[PDB]
Design a protein around this nucleic acid. Structure first.
Ligand SMILES: [Mg+2]
Ligand SMILES: [Zn+2]
Ligand SMILES: [Zn+2]
Ligand SMILES: [Zn+2]
Lengths: 211, 551, 83, 569, 89, 89, 99, 138
DNA sequence: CGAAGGGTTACTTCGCGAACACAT
DNA sequence: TTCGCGAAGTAACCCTTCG
């Protein structure tokens, strides 16, 4: 939850000239920053208000008011150290894969010792906690994980080439009635928000030894 | 799409491809964006410098040139106009950026120059002095000695200051060689016509005989002033020995080491010209005259911009005139320098074994012919090029390349019928190695024809040499290979920079003690293996590039 | 570079025929893209004839930006350009 | 996921001219040409694979999808291809300007022959703020005259003569023994010393073929243009901060091949296959010569035959552009490439960019009709069935374009096409359902209705001398199929109803339709600009009927007067 | 206005025109394009001959200006910053 | 590709001399990226070196050092281990 | 297409565009020469400006700064003729907005 | 796109809800959720706004995360927030731990040890009980 | 004072255009 | 099978200086 000052030009259609001026700009800014994330700034939610709105001018081929605004937006981006509550739904052979309650489901945490044990599902359990020598509590599903967050970088990805993006038509040919079509969906792109940390409280309401 | 073969910049520049690169190698892009920029359009002031490099304002193009000012990489021209202000008009320095490519071998065989006296402390102490001298552009003595904190070690360093000054490696850096030499003549020429505006019936003889020759005799004296001018050194109550003045700057003098490198090239020639015993006494009789009167390498200080009417015969005559009797020490005698204790069978060394170098000039070239020691370094340079140039083209294009390239030198404008009587090629090996060489220079053909539009083929295309093109073209090709090797080094150090910031900061003695996991430790001995090879190729390529730019 | 204040203006307060035909075109293009009209229409089609009635009634919400040869953007309003 | 994308509709300012470097030709290098290239119509029922034309340089048909742009003749843009050739060759357009570089520099050190004070004296005048193109030509001619009179060099020890052409073929034969003739040169001494050795072996050319100095072939000046400078080539006229301003990119070293969008196929006379372009035949011809000049290094054949092959190379690629050479009586020079398709009266600047053919038009014979208003042209009822205006639907169109869309393409107050809100395609009303399709009718449909009464429409007369040959005035739907209008507006067209036909263009957008009638209509252009006199006025049966009512004796009763005033208005 | 009495034809037009494609349509269309890339001409497009070749709006007549739509912004909605975070919380 | 040949390259850093020159090139390149070497940029810059730049910046040539420029970045090892303020790096 | 019996499409000569400039109507030249006859969208690059395909620079192979716009096809087919000989018409782009 | 500042003044959690409850009229709830098939009302014949499926789905899904601890989103007011902000500035606290305290409320002592780093080596023992009394009272 | 170099004006050769658009 | 001026290309000749 930080507050940016992103500036952007806004086109409003000639259909909606009957509404209020700042109500039509806010409708158009919500078509670009609702779920769409800014590269390496964070994840936007909504528009707070508008600032410094001047005369909207036209081009000779559209007839739309290309108005120019600047604004602040409620963008979710925590700083270098922030305690945040997560929820476990899927645990693979790698580390714990958690998320906020319906926000962004790619906040995965690798091994990062002070855990000492990493299994997939031996007795329908995610990991094993080798405590010494009491309170050997573990976690499987939907439990109050309170991980820290780090590493800040979130992104290095933008390729676009026609000999490989039209090779996706071959993956659509491989998307035929063959059931085990695990060629294209197993290699997805890493998004512009990739976040991880240290540990989660060991485990819910406890000491949380050195962050 | 196969961009591995360096096709990305084949028509780029040969001169920009090295200088901007060498500036980028020590500071970076903000310093390489001015020397690489002042080499692309000439001289330029500071006001007309900002809006073309596409960067920061005058607060950055001034700061990064100060880092080039205290490193001696640019040349400035302090002059005013008739109605304007005082402008700057910066230049670029050729040798002042050759120093960055050249410093390591400078110190590493100044060690071998200073090998004579003792063994252990002298090597380390010269490798501490001169390494800090060249890494700066101009430093004094009292500013260096404020970080020694000793009493006898400071005495040894103060002794080695004058021990390096007596050789010819440390002179007082003045403005008179920190100024551009192409306009220092004109400043000594416009006030010289202002000196004599006498109303008198004088023809154009005034503009060729009086002003030109008096400017010659007032210019050749004033360029020899930084050879030896800071010589008083008579401070008695401080030290009991010759002490260098503290408030006097010092530079590298840039020119005696040129002479030492070219003398090393001459000894490397003489190891193949004469036998194994004659070249040793030739070295000990040649490596003593480099410290007295330096004018051996240089294309002359004045000949750069007045050799246009008739003066080249006067340049050659003045060169061979002052070329003799100025190093005129003992030509063939004994000396207490070194005698190389060996069979150098002759178990007697006075006046009988030291006469073998008298039989070193009558055979194939060493060229000290006429009386005793006259003309030893004038009629080598048009053939010292031609001896090394043939050994490159023969070692590259094949042994039959020097058989064709040397025949045309004997008789220019040669036909193919009479070169078959001179060579021994079967039917078509005359023209096959010619077509394999015609893409290179020194093949350059001239055409005869007297026809309309090549009717009956007219017996055309007899071959010449034009040897003044191919030496410059070989110099361009070698210089491009130099800078391309340095860009291979730059791409190597740019590829893996994530494992370099930790390997030199806190990893010194424990690098083998499991600080890196055995999955990428072989990359640390791979980024140090062929990066060693780049500098080895650089070392063995400086010894071949610097022969094609003689006087 | 910036706009002249409305206290002093250099050009004519009149309406040149080149900004009468441009404002008739960029208003009729907005009626075709469903802009609300400001005049009582008598059930007519052809937005060339609607924007002509807008110019006849002087109820058009546009602003003409004149350009100087050096550029100072001289904002003139349409409701006070006499024609 | 789904990161923020935002695009600005930018303009197009400036057009920076340069030349393609050899590294930039091999950047746009989707194919690699000059291996065999006699393969473009091969044995297996003629596909193509790495020849003069490829399926990686586009599509020349409707089938046979391209391997880079997966499309066809209406989808593919075009792709270039480099053609590496040994023994480089002069550019035929960069052949007069090749001298102006090469005459102003030396020929041994290859430095510019110019004093260091005159360099600053020329750069102070050339780099002035506010230099016209005429001023730049004047300064670049002033430096050109000074570098033609200095007979020696500056820092090489070399003499320089005048540099000219060979006789008018594509050779540079110059001299250097022209300026000093008696105390000539040491170069004169070594020239006559290396000439006496020659004449003891071939005394055939002792006095006739003696006065001929040297050639300056592209194989040598490519190695001499590389030598020149880095900082003093801006005095020669070329900018030296973009890495394509070096003077060795003005010689052909790499050769770009055009796409197949440049070279189409050939129609009927199908006794051969789809016939090749002249550019195809010329491009597949220099591949054979470039492979013949390259394979002859390690093969044999002598220096005169290799020189004849290289002369055929330098004459064949110089006829690939502008065709300014004889053919060693086939056709009208038999070759067109890249300038003959750009020379005027059939070219691009003359016949495809300035003057081009435009749809939504039509021409028919004119005929007189005084009963129109003067701002009304009357088009027939069949031109209006095939002249169609895009009238998109918004709240005033909706009750009118719904009764009109059920009316049909055949009945005149109707429509032909209908573009939907999503713009998938354009539906025909001739084949569609046109009742269920007529009912929904969303508020962004671009249904295109026929031309009716009251529409702004241009009207042109083809010998357009002045600005009143093209006028626009309202339409009217009429019987028998001819254009017909008034006779007062007949003098600026210079029409006389002789059988002369005139063409008629319609506007399609609102922005141009609302200005075609406002400042270009008839009622505003009643004058002429050249004098200020009314140009549309009386005609032949206009003042001879106006004169016979007024000859002092035409006396009218009540009953004649009311009939005159009724037929008048 | 150029300075000398000059013509209108193919050498009298090249006195002022830095526009290349205007000169490459009048006469000698071949020689004007080869000479411009040799001299590295910038050719900022502003003439009406080079404006309909690249297909955009002219700077004469109708396109000598642009029209700007009003916004009707009051000085109480946007000029006071309606910020509920007046203190750093 | 295209296979020409160079005579010199192979089998030549096994000796100590070329390795000595190479390691000294590494040492010179490593030291030269430090600017002034702890005693410099103070003495000879006023002494007839670019008077228009040694007069306009008489205390402002001290921007390059290893006593303060390598000093300021070494203070921050202790201000972060005891105090934490949220500021971007 | 040209003439009769293939299909129609009539021609606006060079001596006709002289007349419409004298009226001063600039928005009729965009229609009667670009919109109606030949309008073709194209992918141009921002830096070292050339024309690409499908969002691909093909020379500065990054596909990052490609901003598409519409152009006459006779202007595009001119540029593929100019690049085919030697010369490189490079197009620079500025904003129609931000004044 | 030109980003002026990546942060202007990074914000707390409670006034996000106060900005959302004025934005809930834009994204109406079950008090008017029965108007999906009701009669004409609100002068539109449906009483409904536009969809925004990429914004209606998240404006409900954010506040579901803000009710995790104090179920069985805080129930304080603006003047209560001002009183708990005024008394919190009396201690020498960093801004990051101020934001982590005002984000989620610690009930026990060890969450205050997890938020406030090196509390034993920087603070006194009397401050911790006062902070627990101020925070855990509401 | 006679001869040699630099430079102005004068005689002779090439190429680029020759209008719009329809049916062949 | 044609007129229009503007590019090079080449010769007759006059000024200026050298020993
Ligand atoms: Mg007629
Ligand atoms: Zn394609
Ligand atoms: Zn030269
Ligand atoms: Zn590009």
């Amino acid at each position: 939850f930080i507050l940016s000052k992103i500036a952007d030009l806004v086109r409003i259609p000639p259909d909606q000239f009957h509404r209020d001026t700042i109500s039509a700009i806010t409708h158009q800014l919500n078509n670009k920053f609702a779920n769409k994330i800014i590269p390496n700034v964070g994840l936007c939610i909504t528009i707070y208000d508008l600032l410094t709105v001047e005369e909207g001018q036209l081009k000779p081929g559209d007839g739309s008011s290309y108005i120019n605004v600047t604004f602040r937006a409620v963008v979710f981006k925590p700083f270098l150290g922030e305690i945040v509550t997560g929820w476990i739904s899927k645990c693979t052979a790698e580390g714990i894969k958690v998320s906020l309650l319906g926000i962004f489901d790619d906040i995965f945490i690798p091994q990062n010792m002070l855990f000492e044990g990493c299994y997939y599902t031996p007795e329908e359990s995610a990991w094993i906690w080798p405590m010494d020598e009491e309170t050997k509590l573990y976690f499987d599903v939907n439990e109050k994980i309170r991980f820290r967050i780090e590493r800040e970088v979130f992104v290095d990805v933008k390729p676009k080439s026609p000999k490989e993006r039209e090779l996706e038509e071959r993956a659509q040919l491989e998307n035929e009635i063959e059931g085990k079509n695990e060629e294209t969906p197993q290699n997805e792109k890493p998004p512009a928000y990739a976040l991880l940390g240290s540990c989660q409280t060991d485990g819910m309401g406890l000491v949380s030894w050195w962050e | 799409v196969m961009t591995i073969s360096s096709l990305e910049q084949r028509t780029l520049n040969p001169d920009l491809f090295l200088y901007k690169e060498l500036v980028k190698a020590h500071l970076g892009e903000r310093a390489a964006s001015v020397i690489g920029m002042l080499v692309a359009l000439g001289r330029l002031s500071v006001r007309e410098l900002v809006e073309k490099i596409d960067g920061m304002d005058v607060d950055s193009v001034k700061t990064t040139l100060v880092s080039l000012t205290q490193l001696r990489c640019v040349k400035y021209l302090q002059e005013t106009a008739i109605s304007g202000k005082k402008t700057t008009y910066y230049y670029y320095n050729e040798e002042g950026i050759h120093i960055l490519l050249y410093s390591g071998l400078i110190i590493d065989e100044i060690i071998t120059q200073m090998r004579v006296n003792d063994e252990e402390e002298h090597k380390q102490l010269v490798a501490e002095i001169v390494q800090n001298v060249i890494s700066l552009g101009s430093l004094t003595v009292e500013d260096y000695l404020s970080s020694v904190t000793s009493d006898s070690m400071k005495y040894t360093i103060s002794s080695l200051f004058v021990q390096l000054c007596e050789m010819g490696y440390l002179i007082q850096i003045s403005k008179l060689h920190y100024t551009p030499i192409e306009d220092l003549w004109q400043f000594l020429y416009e006030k010289h016509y202002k000196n004599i505006p006498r109303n008198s019936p004088l023809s154009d003889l005034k503009k060729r005989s009086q002003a030109k020759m008096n400017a010659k005799t007032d210019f050749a004296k004033i360029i020899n002033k930084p050879n030896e001018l800071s010589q008083i050194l008579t401070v008695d109550p401080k030290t009991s020995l010759r002490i260098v003045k503290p408030t006097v700057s010092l530079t590298i003098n840039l020119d005696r080491f040129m002479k030492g490198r070219r003398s090393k090239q001459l000894i490397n020639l003489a190891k193949t010209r004469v036998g194994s015993v004659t070249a040793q006494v030739y070295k000990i009789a040649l490596r003593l005259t480099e410290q007295k009167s330096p004018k051996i390498r240089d294309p002359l200080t004045q000949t750069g911009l007045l050799q246009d009417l008739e003066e080249a015969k006067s340049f050659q005559d003045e060169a061979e005139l002052v070329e003799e009797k100025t190093p005129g020490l003992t030509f063939n005698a004994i000396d207490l320098a070194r005698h190389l204790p060996a069979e150098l069978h002759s178990a007697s060394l006075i006046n009988s074994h030291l006469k073998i170098l008298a039989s070193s000039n009558f055979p194939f070239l060493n060229e000290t012919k006429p009386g005793v020691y006259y003309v030893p370094y004038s009629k080598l340079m048009p053939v010292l090029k031609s001896s090394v140039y043939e050994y490159v083209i023969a070692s590259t294009l094949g042994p039959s390349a020097m058989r064709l390239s040397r025949c045309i030198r004997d008789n220019k404008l040669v036909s193919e019928k009479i070169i078959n009587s001179t060579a021994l090629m079967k039917e078509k090996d005359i023209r096959s190695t010619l077509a394999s060489l015609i893409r290179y220079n020194s093949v350059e053909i001239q055409e005869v024809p007297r026809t309309a539009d090549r009717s009956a083929s007219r017996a055309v295309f007899l071959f010449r040499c034009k040897e003044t093109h191919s030496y410059n073209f070989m110099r361009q090709n070698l210089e491009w290979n130099m800078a391309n090797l340095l860009f291979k080094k730059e791409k190597l150090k740019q590829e893996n920079s994530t494992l370099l910031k930790k390997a030199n900061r806190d990893d010194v003695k424990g690098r083998e003690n499991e600080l890196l996991l055995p999955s990428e430790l072989n990359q640390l001995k791979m980024v140090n293996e062929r990066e060693l090879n780049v500098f080895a190729r650089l070392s063995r390529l400086l010894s071949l590039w610097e022969v094609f730019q003689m006087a | 570079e910036k706009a002249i204040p409305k206290d002093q203006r250099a050009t004519t307060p009149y309406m040149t025929k080149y900004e009468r035909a441009r404002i008739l075109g960029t208003r009729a293009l907005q009626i075709s893209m469903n802009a609300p009209v400001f005049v009582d229409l008598e059930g007519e089609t052809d937005p060339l004839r609607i924007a002509m009635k807008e110019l006849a009634e002087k109820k058009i919400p546009l602003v003409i930006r004149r350009y100087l040869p050096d550029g100072s953007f001289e904002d003139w309003s349409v409701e006070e350009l006499i024609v | 996921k789904e990161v923020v994308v935002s695009e600005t509709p930018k303009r197009i300012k400036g057009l920076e001219f340069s030349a393609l470097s050899a590294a930039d030709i091999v950047a746009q290098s989707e194919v690699e040409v000059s291996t065999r290239d006699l393969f473009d119509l091969e044995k297996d029922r003629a596909p193509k694979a790495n020849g003069a034309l490829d399926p990686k340089m586009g599509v020349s048909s409707s089938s046979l999808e391209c391997a880079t742009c997966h499309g066809n003749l209406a989808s593919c843009h075009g792709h270039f291809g480099h053609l590496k050739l040994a023994l480089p060759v002069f550019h035929i357009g960069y052949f007069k300007a090749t001298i102006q570089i090469l005459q102003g520099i030396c020929k041994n050190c290859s430095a510019i022959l110019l004093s260091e004070t005159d360099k600053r004296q020329f750069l102070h005048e050339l780099r002035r703020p506010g230099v016209d193109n005429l001023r730049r030509m004047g300064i670049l001619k002033k430096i050109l005259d000074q570098c033609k009179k200095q007979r020696r060099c500056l820092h090489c020890g070399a003499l320089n003569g005048v540099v000219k052409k060979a006789a008018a073929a594509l050779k540079i034969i110059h001299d250097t023994f022209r300026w000093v003739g008696k105390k000539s040169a040491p170069e004169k001494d070594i020239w006559v010393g290396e000439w006496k050795e020659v004449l003891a072996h071939n005394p055939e050319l002792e006095r006739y073929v003696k006065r001929c100095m040297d050639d300056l072939n592209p194989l040598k000046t490519l190695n001499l243009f590389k030598q020149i400078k880095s900082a003093d080539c801006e005095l020669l006229g070329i900018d030296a901060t973009v890495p394509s301003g070096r003077p060795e990119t003005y010689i052909w070293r790499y050769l770009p091949a055009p796409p197949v969008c440049i070279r189409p196929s050939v129609m009927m006379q199908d006794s051969p296959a789809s016939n090749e372009d002249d550019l195809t035949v010329k491009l597949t011809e220099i591949v054979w010569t470039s492979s013949l000049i390259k394979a002859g290094l390690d093969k044999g054949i002598s220096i005169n035959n290799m020189m004849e092959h290289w002369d055929y190379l330098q004459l064949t690629v110089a006829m690939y552009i502008n065709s300014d050479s004889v053919n060693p009586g086939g056709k009208v020079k038999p070759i067109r490439g890249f300038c003959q398709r750009l020379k005027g009266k059939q070219g691009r600047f003359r016949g495809n960019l300035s003057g081009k053919r435009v749809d939504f038009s039509g021409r028919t014979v004119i005929s007189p009709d005084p009963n129109l208003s003067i701002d009304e042209v009357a088009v027939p009822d069949r031109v209006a069935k095939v002249l169609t205006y895009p009238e998109k639907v918004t709240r005033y169109n909706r009750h009118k374009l719904q009764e009109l869309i059920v009316n049909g393409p055949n009945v005149h107050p109707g429509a032909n096409y209908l573009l939907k809100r999503n713009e998938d395609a354009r539906r025909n009303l001739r084949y569609g359902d046109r009742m269920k399709l007529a009912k929904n009718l969303q508020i962004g449909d671009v249904v295109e209705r026929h031309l009716e009464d009251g529409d702004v429409v241009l009207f042109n007369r083809q010998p357009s001398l002045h600005r009143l040959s093209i006028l626009s005035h309202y339409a009217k739907i009429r019987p028998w199929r001819t254009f017909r209008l008034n006779e007062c507006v007949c003098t600026p067209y210079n029409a006389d109803f002789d059988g002369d036909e005139m063409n008629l263009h319609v506007p399609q957008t609102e922005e141009a339709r609302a200005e075609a009638i406002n400042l270009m209509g008839v009622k505003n252009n009643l004058l002429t600009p050249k004098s200020g006199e009314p140009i549309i006025a009386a005609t032949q049966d206009f003042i001879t009927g106006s004169y016979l009512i007024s000859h002092k004796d035409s006396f009218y009763d009540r009953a004649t007067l009311t009939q005159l005033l009724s037929m008048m208005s | 206005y150029k300075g000398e009495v000059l013509g209108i034809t193919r050498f009298g037009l090249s006195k002022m025109r830095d526009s290349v494609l205007q000169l490459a349509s009048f006469e000698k269309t071949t020689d004007h394009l080869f000479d411009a890339a040799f001299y590295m001409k910038k050719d900022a497009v502003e003439g009406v001959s080079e404006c309909i070749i690249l297909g955009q709006t002219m700077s004469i007549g109708t396109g000598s200006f642009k029209v700007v739509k009003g916004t009707n912004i009051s000085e109480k909605d946007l000029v006071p910053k309606r910020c509920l975070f007046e203190s750093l919380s | 590709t295209e296979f020409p040949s160079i005579p010199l390259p192979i089998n030549g850093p096994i000796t100590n001399k070329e390795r000595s020159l190479a390691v000294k090139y590494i040492n010179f390149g490593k030291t030269v990226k430090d600017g002034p070497f702890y005693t410099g940029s103070m003495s000879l810059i006023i002494d007839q070196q670019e008077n228009s730049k040694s007069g306009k910046r008489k205390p402002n040539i001290i921007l390059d050092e290893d006593d303060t420029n390598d000093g300021i970045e070494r203070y921050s090892d202790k201000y972060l281990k005891k105090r934490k303020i949220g500021i971007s790096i | 297409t040209e003439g009769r019996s293939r299909d129609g499409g009539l021609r606006l000569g060079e001596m006709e565009r002289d007349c419409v400039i004298a009226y001063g109507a600039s928005q009729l030249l965009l229609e009667r020469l670009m919109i109606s006859s030949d309008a073709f969208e194209v992918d141009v690059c921002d830096k070292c400006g050339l024309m690409g395909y499908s969002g691909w620079c093909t020379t500065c192979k990054s596909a990052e700064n490609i901003i598409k716009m519409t152009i006459p096809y006779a202007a595009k087919l001119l540029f593929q003729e100019l690049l085919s000989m030697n010369i490189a018409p490079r197009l620079r782009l500025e904003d129609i907005f931000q004044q | 796109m030109k980003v002026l500042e990546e942060r202007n003044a990074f914000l707390s959690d409670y006034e996000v809800l106060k900005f959302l409850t004025d934005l809930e009229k834009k994204h109406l709830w079950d008090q008017k959720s029965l108007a999906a098939l009701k009669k004409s009302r609100s002068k539109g014949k449906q009483n409904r706004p536009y969809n925004h499926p990429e914004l209606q789905g998240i404006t409900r899904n954010v506040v579901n995360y803000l009710s995790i601890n104090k179920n069985f989103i805080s129930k304080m007011s603006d003047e209560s927030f001002a009183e708990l902000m005024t008394k919190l500035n009396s201690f020498k606290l960093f801004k990051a731990e101020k934001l982590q305290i005002v984000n989620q409320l610690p009930a026990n002592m060890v969450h205050l040890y997890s938020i406030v780093e090196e509390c034993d080596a920087r603070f006194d023992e009397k401050t911790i009980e006062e902070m627990l009394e101020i925070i855990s009272g509401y």
